[PDB]
Design an enzyme around this catalytic site. Structure first.
Site, PDB file in Angstrom:
ATOM      1  N   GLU A 168      69.286  12.223  41.555  1.00 19.19           N
ATOM      2  CA  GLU A 168      69.061  13.585  42.381  1.00 19.19           C
ATOM      3  C   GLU A 168      70.300  13.439  43.234  1.00 19.19           C
ATOM      4  OE1 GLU A 168      65.507  13.340  43.362  1.00 19.19           O
ATOM      5  OE2 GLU A 168      64.545  12.751  41.759  1.00 19.19           O
ATOM      6  N   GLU A 174      62.048  11.134  38.759  1.00 17.49           N
ATOM      7  CA  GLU A 174      62.102   9.648  38.689  1.00 17.49           C
ATOM      8  C   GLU A 174      61.818   8.993  37.771  1.00 17.49           C
ATOM      9  OE1 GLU A 174      60.255  11.194  41.545  1.00 17.49           O
ATOM     10  OE2 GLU A 174      62.245  11.423  42.842  1.00 17.49           O
ATOM     11  N   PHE A 203      64.646   8.066  47.601  1.00 16.02           N
ATOM     12  CA  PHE A 203      63.866   7.261  48.937  1.00 16.02           C
ATOM     13  C   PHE A 203      62.907   6.459  48.210  1.00 16.02           C
ATOM     14  CE2 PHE A 203      65.286  11.200  50.978  1.00 16.02           C
ATOM     15  CZ  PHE A 203      65.809  10.696  52.102  1.00 16.02           C
ATOM     16  N   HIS A 224      59.330   8.529  53.265  1.00 18.40           N
ATOM     17  CA  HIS A 224      60.742   8.241  53.271  1.00 18.40           C
ATOM     18  C   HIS A 224      61.244   6.867  53.661  1.00 18.40           C
ATOM     19  CE1 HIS A 224      60.941  12.362  51.971  1.00 18.40           C
ATOM     20  NE2 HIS A 224      62.442  12.564  52.254  1.00 18.40           N
TER      21      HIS A 224
END
Ligand SMILES: Cc1ncc(C[n+]2csc(CCOP(=O)(O)OP(=O)(O)O)c2C)c(N)n1
Ligand SMILES: Cc1ncc(C[n+]2csc(CCOP(=O)(O)OP(=O)(O)O)c2C)c(N)n1
Ligand SMILES: [K+]
Ligand SMILES: [K+]
Ligand SMILES: [Mg+2]
Ligand SMILES: [Mg+2]
Ligand SMILES: [Mg+2]
Lengths: 324, 365, 42, 358, 324
Positions: free
Chosen positions: E28, E59, E82, E128
């Site tokens: 991404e 993902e 992340f 994150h």
């Protein structure tokens, strides 16, 4: 009555369904079919499809559905068909439900119990028998329970369901109906986070869980003939650990081993070892050694007998510690 | 209050996915315009492979009940779906099977005895011959779909005129990875063929409990790719659908989703599933009459291209080859822990170096 | 009971000293390696 | 060789998802039939809220640049999609917002100062007032969709005539959980409203790169539920679509997917990052056409707009003051909200940090 | 040249792209935008959209894509934006790519390097900054690498990409531009599974990784003011552990602590303690203690400074060990 572990589990589910109208059971094939291992047999017939129901085939969706249902006051008891499928639902478990009480500062909570079978010795296909307890054990906000007997399974499952935060309840496939034990009828609870002494001993502490408790008791019978008295500690709960019981035992014996079915790099043995060395190193006659599987992927089915730890490995490692 | 035409929407969309059929249950051609170009020998071969595979099913179930096989997901009833789809492929095409799609990868070049070692649980069963473009059967439902997108993209990147083909079931269509795979393949305009074998049940769960979508083929619409629903009991229909998908793919037009309407006569697997708990005998008998072997036999006989002798020859051939394969499986040396360690990494990390030495010593006995 | 680090306990054995006898000069009675040596040397 | 009609298929499915619009960019009614029944006061309140929200975005951006806010996802341009959809809800409805859907949960009852504490990163920001039906903004894209199906099923089982509504962006639609959520809700015929806000960009990623689907509304087809594509800059179109979806849900017919075509005039967030494509969508501003629509009806004025702006600025000033005055977090606070009953490890650590904080 | 860690990562990526045409970078916002933290800036401009490209926002699909590309002979270097998002892609990582060489008996393999940022101290939103290295460390068939300096990041990333099995390469957010270091231009490698001594010492071994290496070096400088000499060992690779380096250190000092940013019940610190207890217990003058975060969910951003372990906690625990 003399029950198998699967019968004890069903009995716990029946009792919770009866005593709490908010309890729901759902997942793949748990309804009409009564579960691929019959753990929910007859529950839908007795309590209805509004309470025991089949879902579409999607573990992530099952997790989301449980979170949602909990937000609406229900007490979800979803099933994940094999714990090797936990990879599909790791966000709902670890990213979401483990964290919702914390995330909302207590405004919402997750009285969820996830049931999943695991464990080797019965020649399953790939990712059916994997020991992945080590993963959810690392997530704050979860509790992780693993019974080794029918009596423990029923009392811990009832505790799990009544617990108002997420509990992962892992059911060893080898232990589902390989033996019977006397189990009280009616409701009883066993505290989550509490180990128990399966065999009292003086010379060495053997800490185990799941199928490895039986392997450890087998080993302790043989170790006795050799003049070694082993105390066998069944963790019952692997997160959180019953530190008091573990340390109590290690302080008496001055020697310990930890036994798991999981790979050496997985499971929860390293955590137990670290806690013992931290709190009781002034009592240790020797290093706390681990009995564990080799660090490969779970074995192709025919290779289970040579790969899975067994009572002979427990004996060998016990004597290693005894002779240190 | 103002009303959106929600009923019309569902009607008009699902109308774009009518069931494709070439041969009806009596083996009459009901769609002559769609008839695939196949030689007399190709037609016979297609029938031979479907008969062979039906015997393989019967023998596999018998071997499992004898303890000679382990995991086994029966295939009888899906022979058109599995065998005629594979028949449309070329050697260069890459197959990503599910756990029931063993017959496809056998016909694509996995030796029968390795298929048996896969059932029993032995690493050698997954040691696919070099240049045979398949993966071992995927146990995680839907994982094969997102992997197929990557295989297709890779084929595209090397400019190969080949496709990735993958199979899942009706149950699998509910998985996030099902959806992400077809969307990724659409987004990259990749040469992937997605097959959904709708055999009406995901273990014990009826397909109508998976989704309220009228068809599974229309799930293609979410990825913006074409979808086809086909009579999965019709070898010619399945073939023509996959062939058309292949043509689209290799000419750079991206993926297709194909839903076959078939049935599994046997249990989900041999590990305890019992169809009497969730379906009637009347349904089973109803789909017994749709047997792909029945219509395809009638179709071939009316063309003079099939006889009982040829059929009995294939059957006896399958039984002998199956008997040799189980023998060859038995003669495979038992796995050692040192074996499993050695295939873990190209170069072993320290922990495995240590454990290797320990089990080597244990194995020296 | 005795309070002693594993190294000390092992040193006691290698030199056949019963550690339950030795008086520890470490914190809170902890027996040290030099106490095993002070028990051997008288 | 035999040709399947795939081009036709793509085109025919497209025809089923035309853009719903009631008000054009000049504030002229172009769909009188679908005009929702709203009082003059409701129309005014709708405008007040959108103006207010626009000012909230401007102030939140300024406060972030001052360091007085933390994480912030700009909303300017999405006021019709966010505020007009919320306007169709009842108090009993449950909102599952993404990370950009702070305005919806404020209007649903989260105090503004708590929204600011959410931004800053303070557990009190997420302590939703009791009886206010919302979750804090979801960071995991798509997770809110599978949770929404469970909330909706919960409402259904209790016989409540309410919906679960949830919001995500165009990037969101590529996630497995996006599809699983709509499909589960479809499968259980659950009263869920799924909203996809298509602001053309997933961070830096154009919507064209998410999917070859020509609309996002048509992804509903995969779950077998109705989908609507709506002009996301049109407060009346958005309102009417969500209202229709709510009516369908509460009457037992299951979920709906709504795709709004909107824009965000600002960056993805304030953490890290065509001029003419920004200018193009600036002319379609929901405020512009709704101002014209109300002014032609004698229902809006500069003075009322200026009044709402000053009201917003004053309420933002007080909310930030109230955030400043909320006491700092202690580790013992974070431990105490982990479980109902602390497990042994957290019991030990509570005592350690209690002693450290003394 | 003097480089920040993010600059060393970009340089390593450039080197591998040029050296090996099978190398692909994707995920991404990695293409046009050059990534959220600019780690891939200018790479698409140099090598083109065929080599460096954006993906849809999913993902699991990115994991699947990497696997399939690897089956077609490519050397994928995907990015997870992340690492708190790993939960979405756990099956591709742990259930699939880690197992493929084993699953196929060496017939296929996965030359994949997953890059992903993690770590606190920069006030990110939820999920994150979490430290989830402990999860992938438990999966056989994966290697997990966590650099703390520019020199280490470039050398380890080239090794990771060249390694023909899956490597998880975790990049600490706080360390991306925290300081500059002289880094050789052109290619060089650093072995995976090899720790190094960041500061020589004789009184206590401090074992750390990630941002905790700087916290430990800071603690060591303060400890030295009081004549306490700490040896600081940077794990660099957390799976597999450099046992020989760790043990060599502890046998020399006779005392040790392990420092991680992760929660006590998470990370890899327990594994390190267990390996030290097992191999060097006879060298210990004191128990091996851990410095780790409280067992709560990762902190709300404003609570980061009271919750994250820092050099003051390292000093405190080191002294506890000196005075035990
Ligand atoms: C991700 C995942 N979840 C659950 C299972 C359990 N499971 C194994 S086989 C099976 C039935 C699947 O049904 P379907 O996709 O229709 O394919 P079929 O078995 O009928 O060919 C299920 C649910 C699995 N193998 N993988
Ligand atoms: C599961 C997950 N993956 C990746 C991200 C990273 N991420 C956060 S916002 C964002 C882009 C936003 O995409 P979109 O769904 O269109 O929502 P928008 O921000 O436009 O409202 C991305 C990629 C995330 N928050 N969650
Ligand atoms: K519970
Ligand atoms: K690699
Ligand atoms: Mg998923
Ligand atoms: Mg099926
Ligand atoms: Mg967007």
């Amino acid at each position: 009555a003399q029950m198998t572990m699967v019968q004890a589990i069903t009995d716990a589910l029946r009792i919770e369904l009866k005593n709490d109208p908010n309890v729901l059971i759902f997942g793949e094939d748990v309804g009409v079919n009564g579960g691929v291992f019959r753990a929910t047999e007859g529950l839908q017939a007795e309590f209805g499809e509004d309470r025991v129901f089949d879902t579409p085939l999607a573990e992530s969706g099952i997790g989301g559905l449980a979170i949602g249902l909990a937000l609406q006051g229900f007490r979800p008891v979803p099933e994940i068909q094999f714990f090797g499928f936990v990879y599909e639902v790791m966000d709902s478990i670890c990213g979401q439900m483990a964290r919702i009480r914390y995330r909302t500062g207590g405004r919402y909570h997750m009285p969820i119990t996830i049931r999943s079978p695991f464990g080797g010795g019965v020649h399953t296909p790939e990712l059916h028998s994997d020991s992945l307890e080590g993963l959810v054990a690392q997530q704050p906000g979860l509790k992780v329970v693993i019974p080794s007997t029918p009596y423990d399974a029923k009392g811990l499952l009832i505790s799990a369901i009544r617990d108002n935060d997420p509990v992962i309840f892992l059911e060893h496939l080898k232990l589902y109906r390989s033996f019977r034990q006397e189990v009280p009828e009616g409701e009883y609870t066993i505290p989550i986070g509490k180990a128990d002494i399966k065999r009292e001993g003086k010379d060495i502490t053997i800490i185990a869980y799941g199928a490895m408790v039986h392997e450890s008791l087998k080993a302790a019978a043989e170790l006795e003939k050799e003049g070694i008295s082993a105390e066998v500690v069944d963790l019952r709960t692997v997160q959180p650990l019953d530190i008091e019981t573990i340390i109590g035992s290690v302080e008496k014996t001055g020697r310990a081993i930890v036994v798991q079915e999981a790979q050496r790099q997985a499971g929860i043995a390293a955590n137990v070892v670290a806690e013992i060395n931290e709190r009781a190193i002034l009592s240790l006659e020797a290093p706390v050694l681990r009995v564990a599987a080799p660090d490969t992927v779970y074995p192709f089915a025919q290779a289970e007998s040579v790969w899975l730890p067994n009572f002979k490995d427990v004996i060998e490692t016990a004597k290693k510690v005894m002779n240190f | 209050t103002f009303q959106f035409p929600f009923a019309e929407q569902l009607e008009k969309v699902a109308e774009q996915f009518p069931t494709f059929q070439i041969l009806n249950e009596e083996g009459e051609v009901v769609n002559e315009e769609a008839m695939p170009e196949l030689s007399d020998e190709q037609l016979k071969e297609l029938m031979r492979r479907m008969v062979y595979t039906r015997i393989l099913d019967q023998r596999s179930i018998s071997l499992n009940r004898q303890g000679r096989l382990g995991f086994y997901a029966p295939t009888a009833g899906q022979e058109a779906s599995q065998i005629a789809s594979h028949f449309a492929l070329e050697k260069e095409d890459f197959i990503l099977p599910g756990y029931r799609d063993v017959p496809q990868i056998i016909w694509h070049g996995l030796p029968l005895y390795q298929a048996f070692l896969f059932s029993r649980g032995h690493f050698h069963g997954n040691q696919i011959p070099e240049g045979v473009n398949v993966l071992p059967p995927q146990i995680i439902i839907g994982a094969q779909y997102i992997q197929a997108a990557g295989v297709a993209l890779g084929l595209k990147m090397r400019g190969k005129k080949a496709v990735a083909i993958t199979y899942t079931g009706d149950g699998g269509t509910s998985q996030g990875d099902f959806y992400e795979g077809i969307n990724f393949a659409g987004a990259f305009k990749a040469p992937a063929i997605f097959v959904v074998q709708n055999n009406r049940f995901a273990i014990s769960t009826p397909v109508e409990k998976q989704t309220v979508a009228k068809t599974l083929a229309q799930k293609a619409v979410a990825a913006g790719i074409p979808g086809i629903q086909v009579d999965g009991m019709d070898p010619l229909a399945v073939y023509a659908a996959v062939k058309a998908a292949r043509e689209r793919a290799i000419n750079g037009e991206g993926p297709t989703l194909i839903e076959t309407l078939c049935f599994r006569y046997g249990p989900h697997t041999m590990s305890g599933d019992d169809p009497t708990r969730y379906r009637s005998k009347e349904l089973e008998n109803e789909w017994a009459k749709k047997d792909p072997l029945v219509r395809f036999r009638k179709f071939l006989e009316a063309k003079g291209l099939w006889s009982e002798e040829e059929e009995n020859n294939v059957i006896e051939q399958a039984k002998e080859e199956i008997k040799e394969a189980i023998k060859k499986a038995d003669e495979t040396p038992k796995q050692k822990v040192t074996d499993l360690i050695s295939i873990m990494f190209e170069e072993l990390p320290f922990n495995l170096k240590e454990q290797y030495e320990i089990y080597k010593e244990k194995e020296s006995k | 009971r005795v309070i002693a680090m594993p190294s000390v306990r092992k040193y006691a054995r290698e030199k056949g000293v019963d550690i339950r006898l030795v008086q520890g000069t470490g914190k809170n009675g902890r027996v040290l390696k030099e106490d095993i040596d002070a028990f051997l040397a008288g």
